[PDB]
Enzyme design. Structure first.
Site, PDB file in Angstrom:
ATOM      1  N   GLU A 196       0.812  -1.219   0.000  1.00 32.28           N
ATOM      2  CA  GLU A 196       0.000   0.000   0.000  1.00 32.28           C
ATOM      3  C   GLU A 196       0.851   1.278   0.000  1.00 32.28           C
ATOM      4  O   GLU A 196       0.820   2.088   0.932  1.00 32.28           O
ATOM      5  CB  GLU A 196      -1.014  -0.060   1.144  1.00 32.28           C
ATOM      6  CG  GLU A 196      -1.980  -1.233   0.989  1.00 32.28           C
ATOM      7  CD  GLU A 196      -3.106  -1.308   2.012  1.00 32.28           C
ATOM      8  OE1 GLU A 196      -3.030  -0.573   2.985  1.00 32.28           O
ATOM      9  OE2 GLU A 196      -4.066  -2.119   1.821  1.00 32.28           O
ATOM     10  N   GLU A 248      -4.126  -9.302  -1.151  1.00 32.56           N
ATOM     11  CA  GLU A 248      -4.687  -9.095   0.180  1.00 32.56           C
ATOM     12  C   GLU A 248      -6.172  -8.775   0.054  1.00 32.56           C
ATOM     13  O   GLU A 248      -6.563  -7.991  -0.787  1.00 32.56           O
ATOM     14  CB  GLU A 248      -4.010  -7.916   0.911  1.00 32.56           C
ATOM     15  CG  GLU A 248      -4.289  -7.880   2.407  1.00 32.56           C
ATOM     16  CD  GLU A 248      -3.660  -6.708   3.160  1.00 32.56           C
ATOM     17  OE1 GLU A 248      -2.417  -6.546   3.104  1.00 32.56           O
ATOM     18  OE2 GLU A 248      -4.425  -5.954   3.804  1.00 32.56           O
ATOM     19  N   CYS A 283      -9.775  -8.418   2.890  1.00 34.99           N
ATOM     20  CA  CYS A 283     -10.315  -8.574   4.230  1.00 34.99           C
ATOM     21  C   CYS A 283     -11.670  -7.876   4.358  1.00 34.99           C
ATOM     22  O   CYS A 283     -12.086  -7.046   3.518  1.00 34.99           O
ATOM     23  CB  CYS A 283      -9.355  -8.042   5.288  1.00 34.99           C
ATOM     24  SG  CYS A 283      -9.179  -6.245   5.204  1.00 34.99           S
ATOM     25  N   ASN A 310     -12.792 -11.421  -9.307  1.00 36.68           N
ATOM     26  CA  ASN A 310     -11.359 -11.408  -9.624  1.00 36.68           C
ATOM     27  C   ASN A 310     -11.025 -12.351 -10.789  1.00 36.68           C
ATOM     28  O   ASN A 310     -10.347 -11.944 -11.736  1.00 36.68           O
ATOM     29  CB  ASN A 310     -10.525 -11.787  -8.407  1.00 36.68           C
ATOM     30  CG  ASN A 310     -10.125 -10.558  -7.621  1.00 36.68           C
ATOM     31  OD1 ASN A 310      -9.051 -10.008  -7.849  1.00 36.68           O
ATOM     32  ND2 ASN A 310     -10.981 -10.124  -6.702  1.00 36.68           N
TER      33      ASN A 310
END
Ligand SMILES: *[C@@H]1O[C@H](CO)[C@@H](O[C@@H]2O[C@H](CO)[C@@H](O)[C@H](O)[C@H]2NC(C)=O)[C@H](O)[C@H]1NC(C)=O
Ligand SMILES: *[C@@H]1O[C@H](CO)[C@@H](O[C@@H]2O[C@H](CO)[C@@H](O)[C@H](O)[C@H]2NC(C)=O)[C@H](O)[C@H]1NC(C)=O
Ligand SMILES: CN(C[C@H](N)c1ccccc1)S(=O)(=O)c1cc(F)cc(F)c1
Ligand SMILES: *[C@@H]1O[C@H](CO)[C@@H](O)[C@H](O)[C@H]1NC(C)=O
Ligand SMILES: [K+]
Ligand SMILES: [K+]
Length: 498
Positions: free
Chosen positions: A235, A340, A342, A370
């Site tokens: 990030e 990643e 979440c 995805n």
């Protein structure tokens, strides 16, 4: 082999309860004979990856929904599925009794579980840490003579990774990502807050930072662990933000471009680790396609970048076509990878919702989305958290597919675990996404792939309340008559002969 022990905590569905003497598990994986298909079913009502079989039939009549496999319409090959061995995950796992630890690791990494083949490894500390550290905290050590792995690596993460590798029959790939550099390499001299590397790409600060990636790989290699890939920064956009609360390192896309072209690319390529892949971005999708345009239109950066890593914060809405779709259209030869994901990060929602079918559906819907936008793999965040969604040194608690309750030496497998496993268990590395065409409009989400050995797998998610009869056609093989119950997810598998 061993079924789910269900328990409700007042949410829409159940968790499965494991402990020192029991966990749900599958028999060793086997395909049904030619002419039969397997169906694994999970439902909000409480079925958990339950196996039934049916005949592949020569004939089909009727006006119902038909999904026709397009086995020769081939898209991306799949790298795989897994999750992150954060300090928080390792602390949670190792707080369990040895037996329960083993049943947790088997849940994720054995064929008696859901067959994960990816582990993301933070390079030193992140928010999912209880201690703030780097591997080189001794100031002004530009040659990194005092680089070393602390016990978070040598006693917690590395031994667990080794145990996961021993349980797996699939080759496991490791992915490394840094959150912060040593503070003496940063403009703000802090692990968090707005701050970047001092100076400019190609100088001592940037060269030291690239060298730290090599020292990291060297150090893990001394522990007999090799990496498939690293990302350029976790990030990078976060470190551009005033007040950013936890470990970060800010790069504009131009800064990342130049750092990769002048420092990280050349330094990795000149090391023993030159076969390690480098992934850019490692950040949220609304930074695309701009970030990909900035980095990949510079041939000096582009020659070092193997893929684009993307994060999915499932709590928030963002466009996929204008981001992932456009990136794939402009840069079709650069792989996209989900590094990643979440849920549960909104302060006003419970971080851990034990038994949330909605959060399960968020996981599988994301995975399908995805895969349908060419992404080659999907990586969960923390492998395990406590009932609070921690530990986390800034209290940035979230949910996890496995929740550890050390007061009971128990862990709970969330709907998210089963929703991810409907993919990870049944899509080996090297599988290729193929087309799947619907005869009529419908409310289902679905994806089809072909295994390396030619076998078919189809995942079907029903986020509606209605049971939907449907037929899958494999033009080479015949018809699968089935049903997609309301609030269910199904994985179908069959052998294909021509
Ligand atoms: C681990 O969990 C299992 C499953 O809940 C426990 O075994 C159950 O114990 C209850 C109470 O004696 C029985 O009604 C069930 O028949 C048992 N189930 C099975 C599958 O054996 C077990 O006691 C727990 N282990 C520990 C160490 O707490
Ligand atoms: C490129 O690779 C070579 C090794 O093949 C590196 O050479 C070593 O550099 C280190 C210091 O960085 C010295 O301690 C060694 O004595 C050197 N060994 C040899 C055989 O030359 C070279 O430094 C690398 N380039 C970098 C890191 O920029
Ligand atoms: C657009 N689809 C949904 C439609 N009911 C459907 C289902 C099965 C066959 C063809 C079409 S989808 O291709 O399945 C899809 C695309 C996405 F971008 C994200 C999804 F979750 C799902
Ligand atoms: C399939 O269709 C044909 C008739 O069009 C028939 O000969 C055959 O028996 C049918 N049933 C099966 C089970 O193959
Ligand atoms: K050190
Ligand atoms: K929360």
């Amino acid at each position: 082999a061993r079924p789910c022990i269900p328990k409700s905590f007042g949410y829409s569905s159940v968790v499965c309860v494991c402990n020192a003497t029991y966990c749900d598990s599958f028999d060793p994986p086997t395909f049904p004979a030619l002419g039969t298909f397997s169906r694994y079913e999970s439902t909000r009502s409480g079925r958990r990856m339950e196996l039934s079989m049916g005949p592949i039939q020569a004939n089909h009549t009727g006006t119902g929904l038909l999904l026709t496999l397009q086995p020769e319409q081939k898209f991306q090959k799949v790298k795989g599925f897994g999750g992150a061995m954060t300090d928080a995950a390792a602390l949670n796992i190792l707080a369990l009794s040895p037996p329960a630890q083993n049943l947790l690791l088997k849940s994720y990494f054995s064929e008696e579980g859901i067959g994960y083949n990816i582990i993301r490894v933070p390079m030193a500390s992140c928010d999912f840490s209880i201690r703030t550290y780097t591997y080189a905290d001794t100031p002004d050590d530009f040659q990194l003579h005092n680089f070393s792995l602390p016990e978070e690596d040598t006693k917690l993460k590395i031994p667990l990774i080794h145990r996961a590798l021993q349980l797996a029959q699939r080759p496991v790939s490791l992915l490394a990502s840094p959150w912060t550099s040593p503070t003496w390499l940063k403009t703000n001299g802090a692990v968090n807050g707005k701050g970047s590397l001092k100076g400019q790409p190609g100088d001592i600060y940037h060269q030291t930072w690239a060298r730290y990636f090599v020292k990291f790989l060297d150090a893990y290699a001394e522990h007999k662990l090799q990496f498939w890939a690293v990302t350029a920064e976790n990030e990078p956009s976060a470190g551009l933000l005033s007040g950013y609360p936890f470990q970060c390192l800010g790069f504009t896309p131009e800064h990342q471009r130049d750092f990769i072209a002048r420092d990280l690319g050349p330094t990795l390529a000149n090391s023993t680790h030159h076969n390690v892949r480098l992934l850019m971005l490692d950040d949220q999708r609304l930074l695309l396609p701009h970030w990909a345009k900035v980095v990949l239109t510079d041939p000096e950066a582009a020659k070092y970048v193997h893929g684009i890593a993307v994060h999915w914060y499932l709590d928030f809405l963002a466009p996929a076509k204008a981001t992932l779709g456009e990136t794939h259209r402009l840069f079709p030869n650069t792989m996209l990878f989900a590094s990643e994901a979440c849920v549960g990060s909104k302060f006003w929602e419970q971080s851990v919702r034990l038994g949330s079918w909605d959060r399960g559906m968020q996981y599988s819907h994301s995975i399908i989305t995805n895969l349908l936008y060419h992404v080659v793999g999907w990586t969960d965040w923390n492998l395990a958290l406590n009932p609070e969604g921690g530990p986390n040194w800034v209290r940035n608690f979230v949910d996890s597919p496995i929740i550890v309750d050390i007061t009971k030496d128990t862990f709970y497998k969330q709907p998210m675990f089963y929703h991810l496993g409907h993919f990870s268990k049944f899509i080996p590395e090297g599988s290729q996404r193929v087309g799947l065409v619907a005869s009529q409009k419908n409310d289902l989400d679905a994806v089809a792939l072909m295994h390396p050995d030619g076998s078919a797998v189809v995942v079907v998610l029903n986020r509606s309340s209605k049971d939907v009869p449907l037929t899958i056609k494999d033009p080479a093989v015949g018809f699968l008559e089935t049903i997609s119950p309301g609030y269910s997810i199904h994985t179908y598998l069959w052998r294909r002969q021509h």
